[PDB]
Each structure stands twice: as C-alpha cells, then as structure tokens.
Coordinates of C-alpha atoms and ligand atoms in Angstrom, one line a residue:
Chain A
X1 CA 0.0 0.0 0.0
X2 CA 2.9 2.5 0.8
X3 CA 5.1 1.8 -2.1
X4 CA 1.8 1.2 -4.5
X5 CA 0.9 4.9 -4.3
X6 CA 4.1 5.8 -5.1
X7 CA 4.3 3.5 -7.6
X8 CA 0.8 5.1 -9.1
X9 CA 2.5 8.4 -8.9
X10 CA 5.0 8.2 -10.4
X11 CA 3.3 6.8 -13.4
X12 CA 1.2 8.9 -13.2
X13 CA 3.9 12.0 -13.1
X14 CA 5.7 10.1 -16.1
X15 CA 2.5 10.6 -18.0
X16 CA 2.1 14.6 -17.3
X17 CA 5.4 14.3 -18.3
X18 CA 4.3 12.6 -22.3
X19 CA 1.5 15.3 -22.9
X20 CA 3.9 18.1 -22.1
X21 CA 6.3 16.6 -24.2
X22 CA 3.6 16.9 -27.1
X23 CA 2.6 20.1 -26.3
X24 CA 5.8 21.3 -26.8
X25 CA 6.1 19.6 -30.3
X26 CA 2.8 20.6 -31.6
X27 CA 3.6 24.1 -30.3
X28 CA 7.3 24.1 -31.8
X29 CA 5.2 22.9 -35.0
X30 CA 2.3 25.2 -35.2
X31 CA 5.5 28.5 -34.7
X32 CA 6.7 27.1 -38.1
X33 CA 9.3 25.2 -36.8
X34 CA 10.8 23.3 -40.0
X35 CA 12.0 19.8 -39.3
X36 CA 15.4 19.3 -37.7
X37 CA 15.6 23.5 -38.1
X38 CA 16.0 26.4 -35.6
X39 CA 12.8 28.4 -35.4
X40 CA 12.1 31.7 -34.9
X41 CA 9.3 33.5 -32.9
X42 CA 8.4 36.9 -32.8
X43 CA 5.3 39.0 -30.1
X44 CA 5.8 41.8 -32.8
X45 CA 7.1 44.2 -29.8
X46 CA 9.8 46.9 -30.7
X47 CA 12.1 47.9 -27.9
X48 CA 15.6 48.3 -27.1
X49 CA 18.3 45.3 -27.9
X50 CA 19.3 45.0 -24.1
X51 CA 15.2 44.5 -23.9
X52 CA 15.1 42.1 -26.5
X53 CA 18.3 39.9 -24.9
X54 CA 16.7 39.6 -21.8
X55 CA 13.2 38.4 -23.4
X56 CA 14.6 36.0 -25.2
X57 CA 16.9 34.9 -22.5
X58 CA 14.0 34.5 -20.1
X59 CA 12.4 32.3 -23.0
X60 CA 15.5 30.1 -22.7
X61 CA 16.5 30.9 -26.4
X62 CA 18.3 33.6 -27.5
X63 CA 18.2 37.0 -30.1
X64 CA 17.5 35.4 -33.7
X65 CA 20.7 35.1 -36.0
X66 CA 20.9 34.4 -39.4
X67 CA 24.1 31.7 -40.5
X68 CA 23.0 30.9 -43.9
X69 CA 20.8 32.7 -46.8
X70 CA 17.9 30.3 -45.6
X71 CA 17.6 31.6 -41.7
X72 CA 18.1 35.2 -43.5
X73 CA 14.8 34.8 -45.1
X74 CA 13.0 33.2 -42.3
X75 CA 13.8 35.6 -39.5
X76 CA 12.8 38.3 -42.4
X77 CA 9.8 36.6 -42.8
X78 CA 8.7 36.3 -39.2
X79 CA 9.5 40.1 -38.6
X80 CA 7.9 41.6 -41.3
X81 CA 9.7 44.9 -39.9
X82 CA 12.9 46.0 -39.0
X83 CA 14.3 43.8 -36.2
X84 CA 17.4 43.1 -34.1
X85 CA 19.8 40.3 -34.5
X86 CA 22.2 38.8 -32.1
X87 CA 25.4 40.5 -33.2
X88 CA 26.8 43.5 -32.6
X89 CA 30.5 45.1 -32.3
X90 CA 30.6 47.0 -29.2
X91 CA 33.5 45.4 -27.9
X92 CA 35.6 45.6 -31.2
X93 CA 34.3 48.5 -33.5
X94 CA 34.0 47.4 -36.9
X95 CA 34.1 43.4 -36.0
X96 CA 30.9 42.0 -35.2
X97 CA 30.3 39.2 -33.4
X98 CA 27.9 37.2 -31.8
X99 CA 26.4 37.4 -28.6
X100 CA 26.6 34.2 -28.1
X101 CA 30.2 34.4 -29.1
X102 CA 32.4 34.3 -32.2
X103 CA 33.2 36.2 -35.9
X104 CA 30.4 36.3 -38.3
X105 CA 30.4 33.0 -40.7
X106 CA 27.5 34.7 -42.6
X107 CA 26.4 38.1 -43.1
X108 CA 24.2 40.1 -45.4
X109 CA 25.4 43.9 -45.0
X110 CA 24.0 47.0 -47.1
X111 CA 27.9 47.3 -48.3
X112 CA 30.7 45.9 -46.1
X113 CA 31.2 45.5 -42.9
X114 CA 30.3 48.6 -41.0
X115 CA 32.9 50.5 -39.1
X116 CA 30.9 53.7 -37.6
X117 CA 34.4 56.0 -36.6
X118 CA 32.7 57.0 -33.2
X119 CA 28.9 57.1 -33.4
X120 CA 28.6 54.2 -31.8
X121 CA 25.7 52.3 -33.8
X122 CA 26.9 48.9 -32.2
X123 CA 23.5 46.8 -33.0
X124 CA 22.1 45.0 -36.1
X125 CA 18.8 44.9 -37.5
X126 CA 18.0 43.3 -40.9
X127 CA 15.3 45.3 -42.9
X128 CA 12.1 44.4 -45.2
X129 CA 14.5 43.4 -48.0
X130 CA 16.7 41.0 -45.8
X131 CA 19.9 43.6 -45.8
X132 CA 21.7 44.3 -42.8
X133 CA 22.8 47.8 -41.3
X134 CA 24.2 48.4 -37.9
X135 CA 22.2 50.6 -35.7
X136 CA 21.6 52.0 -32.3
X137 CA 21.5 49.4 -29.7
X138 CA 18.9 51.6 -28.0
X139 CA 16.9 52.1 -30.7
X140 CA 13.6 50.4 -30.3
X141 CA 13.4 47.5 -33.4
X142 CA 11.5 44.0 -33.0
X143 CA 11.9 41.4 -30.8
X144 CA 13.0 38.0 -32.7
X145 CA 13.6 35.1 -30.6
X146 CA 15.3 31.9 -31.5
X147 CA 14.9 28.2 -30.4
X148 CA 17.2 25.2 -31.5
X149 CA 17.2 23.0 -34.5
Chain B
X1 CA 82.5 41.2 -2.8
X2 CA 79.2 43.5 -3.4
X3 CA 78.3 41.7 -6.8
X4 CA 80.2 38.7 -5.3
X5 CA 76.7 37.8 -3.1
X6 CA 74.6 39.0 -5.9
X7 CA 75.9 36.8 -8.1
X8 CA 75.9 33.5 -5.7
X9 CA 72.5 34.3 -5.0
X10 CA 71.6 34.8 -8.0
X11 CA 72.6 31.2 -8.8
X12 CA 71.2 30.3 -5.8
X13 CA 68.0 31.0 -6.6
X14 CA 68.8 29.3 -9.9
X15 CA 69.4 25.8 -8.4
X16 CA 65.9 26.2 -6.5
X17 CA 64.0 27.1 -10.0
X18 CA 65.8 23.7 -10.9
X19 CA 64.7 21.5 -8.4
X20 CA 60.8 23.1 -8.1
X21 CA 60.8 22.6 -12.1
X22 CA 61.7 18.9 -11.1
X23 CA 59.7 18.8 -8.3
X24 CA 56.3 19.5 -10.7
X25 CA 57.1 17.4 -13.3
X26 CA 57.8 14.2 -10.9
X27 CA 54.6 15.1 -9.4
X28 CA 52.4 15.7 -12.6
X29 CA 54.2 11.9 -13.8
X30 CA 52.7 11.0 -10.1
X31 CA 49.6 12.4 -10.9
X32 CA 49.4 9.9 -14.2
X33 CA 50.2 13.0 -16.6
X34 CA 50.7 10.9 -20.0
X35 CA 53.2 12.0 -22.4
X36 CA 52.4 15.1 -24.4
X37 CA 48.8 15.1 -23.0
X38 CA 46.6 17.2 -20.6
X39 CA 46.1 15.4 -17.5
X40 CA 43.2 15.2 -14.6
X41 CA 42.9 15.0 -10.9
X42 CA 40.1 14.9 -8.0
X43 CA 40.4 15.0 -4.6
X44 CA 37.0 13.0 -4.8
X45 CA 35.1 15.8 -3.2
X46 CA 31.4 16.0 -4.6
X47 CA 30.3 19.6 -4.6
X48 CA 27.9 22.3 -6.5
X49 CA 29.4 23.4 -9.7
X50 CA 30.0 26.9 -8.6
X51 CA 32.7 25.6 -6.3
X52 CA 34.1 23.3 -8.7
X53 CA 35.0 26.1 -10.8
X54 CA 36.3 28.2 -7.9
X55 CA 38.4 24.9 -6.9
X56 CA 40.2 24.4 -10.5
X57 CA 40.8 27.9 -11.2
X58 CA 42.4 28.3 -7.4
X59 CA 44.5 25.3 -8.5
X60 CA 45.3 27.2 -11.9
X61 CA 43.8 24.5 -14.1
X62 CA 40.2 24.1 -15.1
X63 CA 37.1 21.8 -15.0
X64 CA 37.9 18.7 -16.8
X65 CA 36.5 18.6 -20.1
X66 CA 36.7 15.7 -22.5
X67 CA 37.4 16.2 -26.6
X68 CA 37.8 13.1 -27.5
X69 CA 37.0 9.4 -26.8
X70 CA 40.5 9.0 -25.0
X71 CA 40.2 12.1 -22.7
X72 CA 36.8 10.6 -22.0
X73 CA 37.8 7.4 -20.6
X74 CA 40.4 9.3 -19.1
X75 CA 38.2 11.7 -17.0
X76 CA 35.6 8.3 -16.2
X77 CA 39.0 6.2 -14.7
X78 CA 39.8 9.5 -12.8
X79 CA 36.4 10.2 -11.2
X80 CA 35.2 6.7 -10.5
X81 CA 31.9 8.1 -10.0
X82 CA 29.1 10.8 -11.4
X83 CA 31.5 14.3 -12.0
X84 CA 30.8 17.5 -13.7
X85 CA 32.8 18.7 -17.0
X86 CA 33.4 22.1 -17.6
X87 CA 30.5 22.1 -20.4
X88 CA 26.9 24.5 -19.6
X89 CA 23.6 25.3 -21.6
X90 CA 23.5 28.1 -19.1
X91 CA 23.4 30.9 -21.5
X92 CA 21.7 29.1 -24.7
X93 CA 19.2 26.3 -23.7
X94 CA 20.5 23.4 -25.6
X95 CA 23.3 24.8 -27.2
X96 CA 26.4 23.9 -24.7
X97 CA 29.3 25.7 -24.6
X98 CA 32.7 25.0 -22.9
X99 CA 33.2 27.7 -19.8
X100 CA 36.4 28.5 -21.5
X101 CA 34.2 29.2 -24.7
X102 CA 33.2 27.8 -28.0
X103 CA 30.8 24.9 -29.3
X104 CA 31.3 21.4 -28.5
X105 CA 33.3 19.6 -31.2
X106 CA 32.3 16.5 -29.1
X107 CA 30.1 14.9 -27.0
X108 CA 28.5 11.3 -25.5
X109 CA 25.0 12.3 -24.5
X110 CA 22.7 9.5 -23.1
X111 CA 20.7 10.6 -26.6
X112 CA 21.2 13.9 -27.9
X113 CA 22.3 17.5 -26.5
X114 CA 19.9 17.8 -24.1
X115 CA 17.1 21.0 -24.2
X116 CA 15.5 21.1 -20.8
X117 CA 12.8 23.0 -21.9
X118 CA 12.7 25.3 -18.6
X119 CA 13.7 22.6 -16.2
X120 CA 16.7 24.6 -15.4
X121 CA 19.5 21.2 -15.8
X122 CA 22.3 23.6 -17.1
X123 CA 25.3 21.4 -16.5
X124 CA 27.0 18.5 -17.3
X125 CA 28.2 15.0 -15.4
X126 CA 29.7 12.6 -16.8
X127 CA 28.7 8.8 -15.5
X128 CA 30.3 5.3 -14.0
X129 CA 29.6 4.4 -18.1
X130 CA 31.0 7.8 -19.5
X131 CA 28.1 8.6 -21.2
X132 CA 26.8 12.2 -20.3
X133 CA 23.4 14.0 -19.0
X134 CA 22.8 17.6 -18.5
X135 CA 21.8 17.7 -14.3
X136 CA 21.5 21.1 -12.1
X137 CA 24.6 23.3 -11.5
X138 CA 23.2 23.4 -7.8
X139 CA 23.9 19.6 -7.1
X140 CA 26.6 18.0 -5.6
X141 CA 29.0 16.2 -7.9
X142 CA 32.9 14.9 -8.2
X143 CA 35.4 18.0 -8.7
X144 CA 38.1 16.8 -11.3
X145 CA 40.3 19.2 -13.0
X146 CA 42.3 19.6 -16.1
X147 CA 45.7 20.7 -16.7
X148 CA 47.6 21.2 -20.1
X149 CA 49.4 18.6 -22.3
Chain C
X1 CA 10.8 78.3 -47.8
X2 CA 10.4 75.7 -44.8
X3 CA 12.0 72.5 -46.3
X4 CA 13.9 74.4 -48.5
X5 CA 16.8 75.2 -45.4
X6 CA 15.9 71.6 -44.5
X7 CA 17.2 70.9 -48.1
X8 CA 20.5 73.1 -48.0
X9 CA 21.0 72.2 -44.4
X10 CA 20.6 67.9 -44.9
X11 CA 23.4 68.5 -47.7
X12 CA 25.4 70.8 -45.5
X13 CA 25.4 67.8 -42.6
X14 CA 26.0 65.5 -46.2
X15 CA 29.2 67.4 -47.7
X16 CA 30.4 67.5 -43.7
X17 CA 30.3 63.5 -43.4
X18 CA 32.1 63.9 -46.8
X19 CA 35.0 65.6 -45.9
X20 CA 35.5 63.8 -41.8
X21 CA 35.3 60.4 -44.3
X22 CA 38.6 61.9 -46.3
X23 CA 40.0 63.0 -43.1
X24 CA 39.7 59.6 -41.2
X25 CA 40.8 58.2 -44.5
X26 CA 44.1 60.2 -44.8
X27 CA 44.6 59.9 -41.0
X28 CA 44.9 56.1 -41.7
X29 CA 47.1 56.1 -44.3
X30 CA 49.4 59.1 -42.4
X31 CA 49.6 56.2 -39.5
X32 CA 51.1 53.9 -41.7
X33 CA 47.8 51.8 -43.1
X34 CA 48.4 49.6 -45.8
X35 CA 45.8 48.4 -48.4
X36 CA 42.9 46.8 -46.9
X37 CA 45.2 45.6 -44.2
X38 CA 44.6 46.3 -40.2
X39 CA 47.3 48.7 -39.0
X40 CA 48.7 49.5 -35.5
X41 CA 49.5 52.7 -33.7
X42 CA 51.0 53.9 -30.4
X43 CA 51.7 56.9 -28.5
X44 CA 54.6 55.3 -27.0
X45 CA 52.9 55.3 -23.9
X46 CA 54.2 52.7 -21.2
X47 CA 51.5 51.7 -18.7
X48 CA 49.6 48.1 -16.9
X49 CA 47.8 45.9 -19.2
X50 CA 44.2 47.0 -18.0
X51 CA 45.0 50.9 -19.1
X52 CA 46.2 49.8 -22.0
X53 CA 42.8 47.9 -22.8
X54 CA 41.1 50.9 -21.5
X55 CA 42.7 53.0 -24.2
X56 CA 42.3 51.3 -27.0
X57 CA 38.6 50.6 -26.5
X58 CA 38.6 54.3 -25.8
X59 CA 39.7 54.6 -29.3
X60 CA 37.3 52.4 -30.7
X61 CA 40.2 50.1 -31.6
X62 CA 41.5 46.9 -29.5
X63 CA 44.7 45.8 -28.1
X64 CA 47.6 44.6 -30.9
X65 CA 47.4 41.3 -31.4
X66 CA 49.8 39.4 -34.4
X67 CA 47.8 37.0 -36.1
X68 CA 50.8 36.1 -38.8
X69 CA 54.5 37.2 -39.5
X70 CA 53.8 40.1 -40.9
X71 CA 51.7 41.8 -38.4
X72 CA 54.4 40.5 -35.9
X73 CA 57.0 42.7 -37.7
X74 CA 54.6 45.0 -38.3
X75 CA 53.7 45.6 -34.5
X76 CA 57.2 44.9 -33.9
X77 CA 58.5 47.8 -35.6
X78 CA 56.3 50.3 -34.5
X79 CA 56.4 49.5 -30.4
X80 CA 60.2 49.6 -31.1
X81 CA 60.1 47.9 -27.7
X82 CA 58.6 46.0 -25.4
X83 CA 54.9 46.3 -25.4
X84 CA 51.6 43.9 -24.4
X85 CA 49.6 42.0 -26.9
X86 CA 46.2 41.4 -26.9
X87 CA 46.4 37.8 -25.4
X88 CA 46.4 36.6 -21.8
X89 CA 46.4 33.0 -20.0
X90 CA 44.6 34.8 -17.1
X91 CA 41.6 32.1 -17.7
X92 CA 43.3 29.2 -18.0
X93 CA 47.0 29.2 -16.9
X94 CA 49.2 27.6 -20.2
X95 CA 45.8 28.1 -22.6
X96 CA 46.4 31.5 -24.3
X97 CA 43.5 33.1 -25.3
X98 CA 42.7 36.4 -27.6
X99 CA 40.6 39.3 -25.5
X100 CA 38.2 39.3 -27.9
X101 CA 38.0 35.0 -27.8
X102 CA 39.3 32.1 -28.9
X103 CA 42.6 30.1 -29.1
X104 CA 45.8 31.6 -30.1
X105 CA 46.0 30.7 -34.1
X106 CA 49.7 32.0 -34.5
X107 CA 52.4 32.6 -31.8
X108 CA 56.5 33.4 -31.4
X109 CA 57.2 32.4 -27.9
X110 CA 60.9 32.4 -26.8
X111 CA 60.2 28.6 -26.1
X112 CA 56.5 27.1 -26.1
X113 CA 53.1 28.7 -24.7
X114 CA 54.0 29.4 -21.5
X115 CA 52.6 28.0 -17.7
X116 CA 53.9 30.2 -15.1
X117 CA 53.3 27.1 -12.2
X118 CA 51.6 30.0 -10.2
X119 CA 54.1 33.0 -10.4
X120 CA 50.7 34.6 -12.2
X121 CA 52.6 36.2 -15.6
X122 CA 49.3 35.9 -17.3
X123 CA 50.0 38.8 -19.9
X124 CA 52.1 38.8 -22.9
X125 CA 54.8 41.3 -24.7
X126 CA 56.6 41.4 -28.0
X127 CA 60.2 42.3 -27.1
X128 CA 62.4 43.9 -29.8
X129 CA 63.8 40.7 -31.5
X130 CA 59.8 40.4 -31.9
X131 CA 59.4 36.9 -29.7
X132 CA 56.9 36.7 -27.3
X133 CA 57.1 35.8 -23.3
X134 CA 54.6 35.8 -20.7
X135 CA 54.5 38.7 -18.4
X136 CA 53.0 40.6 -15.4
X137 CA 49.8 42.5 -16.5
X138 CA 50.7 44.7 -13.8
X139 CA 54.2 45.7 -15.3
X140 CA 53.7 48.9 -17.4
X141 CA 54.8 48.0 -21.2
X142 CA 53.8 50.3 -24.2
X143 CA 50.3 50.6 -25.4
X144 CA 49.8 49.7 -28.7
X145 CA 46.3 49.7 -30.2
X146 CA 44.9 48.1 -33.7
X147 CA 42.7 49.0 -35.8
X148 CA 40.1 47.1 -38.8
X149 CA 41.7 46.2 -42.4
Ligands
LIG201 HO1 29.7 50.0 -34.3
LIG202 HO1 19.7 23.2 -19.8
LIG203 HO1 50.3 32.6 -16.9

C-alpha cells in the first residue's frame, strides 16, 4: 500500500510528463518550426536590444541570428519589420560578433562590414528586404527570438 | 665582494628554479600525466558546480572537459563516480558551450544534446559508463580538474 | 521656404560627413595603413595591461594582437620595444587566449606557450627581437592599439 501509491505516482507523473512533451512539439510545429531546423518566434514588440536579450533569455533561447541565406529569409519573414539580430561590435568597433560568441560565418550587410568611426551604432537589424545595417543598440526595433534546430 | 653575493644568490635561486621545475614534473608523472597530453585529478570531493569552478581555477587548471574518446575514458577512470565537466547550456538552452568558450566539437550524450525546456538542468556529469546528461549546476558532484598537455 | 533650409542644411550635414570620411581616410594612411590591411598605432605610452585595454577601446580600436609574421614585424616595428599584446592566460593558466575570444591561431614564444606554475605572468609582450614571453599585466609595457583592415 505505501510503495503502491508511489508507484501510481509516479506513473502517473511520467505521463504529465508525455503530454507536455507533445505540447511542446505541436507548439514548436504550429511556430513554423521546420524539421530538424532552428525556429524563430516573434510577439511583434519593438524595444531596445538589451530589452530584447533579456526576453529571449527569459524564454530560454536567445536573439534570432541568421548563418545561412535560408535563416536570413526566415527571420525576415517572421519580422515583417525591422528587427534586431544577435550580433553586434561594441567590444571591437568594426568586427561583429555574436552574442553568443564568435566572428560572423554569414552576413548580409547594405555594403561591407560597418565601421561607424565613433557614433557608436553597435546593434544590427535586418530590414524588409533582408539587408543588414548596424544601428543604435537603443533604438527600439522587433523582438525576434530563436529556439534550437 | 658586493656583486660577489649578488651573483651567488643569484645562482642560488637558480638551483631552486631547478629542483621546483623537477619537483612538478615528478609530481604531474605521479599524478598519471601521459606524455604530451593534458592530464586530470580529483580530490574525490562531490560539490555544486559553482565551487568546482572556484576549486580548478584556485589550482590554476580548469574543469575537466573531454574532446575526445581518449580524454573521455580518461576523465571516467579518474572520477570513478558521477562528475561534472566544464561544459553548460547556461546561456543558450541546448546549445552547450565550454566555460572557456566555444561549441562542443564533441560529445557522449545518453541521446542527444539535451534542451531542458525550462527545467533549469544547465550542467553537465559525466557517469560510471562515460556517457553524459545535462543535471543542475546546484547539485553536488565529483570535482576533477584539467591541466595542459 | 520651410523644407527648403531643411534641403540646404541635410546636404550641408552631407558634404560635412564627406569631408571627416577623407580626413579619417588620410589619418589612416598618415599612420602607416596599408591596403585593406589592419594597422597599428601607439603613443609610445608605457602603462599596466588594464589601461592599456582601457585606451584602446577608448579609441574604438582593441589591443595589438599578431595574427601572422607580418603583423608581428609589423607591430614589432612600430612598439620599437617592449609592449603587451592582446592575449592573456589569465583564464586558463598555459591556454592563451585572444581578449576578444578564442585560441591563439599564430604565436612566437621564446620557447612554447608558456605555464607560469603560479608566479601569475598571465600577460604577454613582443620584445624587440619580436618573440613573445609571458608577463606581469601589472608591469607597465607600451600601449599599442589596432585598428580594422
Ligand atoms: Ho559600431
Ligand atoms: Ho539546460
Ligand atoms: Ho600565466
């Protein structure tokens, strides 16, 4: 009788834990989340980058970057406005990195990398045609969240 | 007989550089440091990862990480029991990251990287088996530490 | 009347970002820029490690750091003596790593990458003869800041 209910519990918390497993798919699915893919999730909000960082941070992903042509076009697509990505080059002006770490593998700049000789635009945001320009970090763009492949 | 002291203390200290150079690497040999290879130790004291950290860096090494199948088994032989690796998803939910930086270029997950999906499990211990499982930074687990090759 | 000073005054703010652009670029070249190259510059200036750092991110620019033999020679002769690079093992004692991230890809140490065994050189100067050897952060050194190909 004593181990029996726990026995029944623990079944029974090994179910709760199935459905929320589902829940999580289906939701992952119905974002547009693209088979073995990073997704990308957007509330439409504009604020400022340090905003947007911690938003996504509390959601336990991180500020949407594009690595290939394809993510470039998805984030775009999810945004439908101007919106921040998760690079910048306020450590080293000129050299973007990411905020998770690292040198840019991918990048889809107006011209060339963008070296601003003291105005300090040290944020990105990529626009309605997919090009990127850096910006002011405390400028209010929208808030673009991404989630693992 | 100014310079004369200078210069037979100067040798002096010399001969003691010598024998603490010997001394360290009789006792890295000791330690079962293998040819041309980075090396771990514990002291077999489970603790949160937090003071791991703090432990390895005091000791001017760092938490053992494992690159490779060799270093793997290595690390398992040395721990004898559940131990963390210097490996989080602290930052980026299911993206782990070395504490010294950068992307794993391998693993031995019990499946797959691990996403916790807001459980919070942001580091990593590696098994009796040597396989691996994300578990909380707050629990207590085998300090082992990793020095260079 | 009304957008026309707009008009005359948004060109007058244009042909003023034309001429600072030919200034900076002249500035660069005067400092010894080559080609689409990165170039260094110093004041001569011999100070700690951390006001050093300070400086050169005060300047938009980052601590000199030789990535190949020709920006070794090319730091080399304008420090025309000892002055810090932008590496330090202050992380990971033995494991050099750039300010700005990552694992030394080039290197001219006297001998090999350096462990100190807990005399705490964690910093690193270019000496005349252009080798490299760990060093005191706190030592003073010249400063000696980069700047973007
Ligand atoms: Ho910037
Ligand atoms: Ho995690
Ligand atoms: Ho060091």
């Amino acid at each position: 009788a004593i181990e029996v209910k726990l026995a029944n519990m623990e079944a029974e918390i090994n179910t709760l834990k199935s459905k929320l497993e589902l829940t999580n798919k289906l939701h992952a699915f119905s974002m547009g989340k693209k088979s073995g893919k990073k997704f990308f999730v957007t509330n439409h909000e504009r604020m400022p980058f340090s905003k947007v960082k911690a938003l996504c941070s509390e959601l336990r992903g991180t500020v949407a970057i594009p690595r290939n042509a394809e993510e470039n076009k998805a984030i775009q697509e999810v945004a439908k406005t101007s919106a921040f990505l998760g690079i910048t080059d306020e450590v080293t002006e000129g050299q973007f990195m990411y905020v998770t770490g690292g040198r840019l593998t991918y990048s889809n700049w107006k011209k060339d990398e963008p070296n601003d000789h003291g105005s300090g635009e040290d944020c990105v945001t990529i626009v309605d045609n997919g090009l990127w320009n850096d910006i002011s970090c405390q400028a209010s763009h929208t808030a673009v969240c991404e989630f693992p492949a």
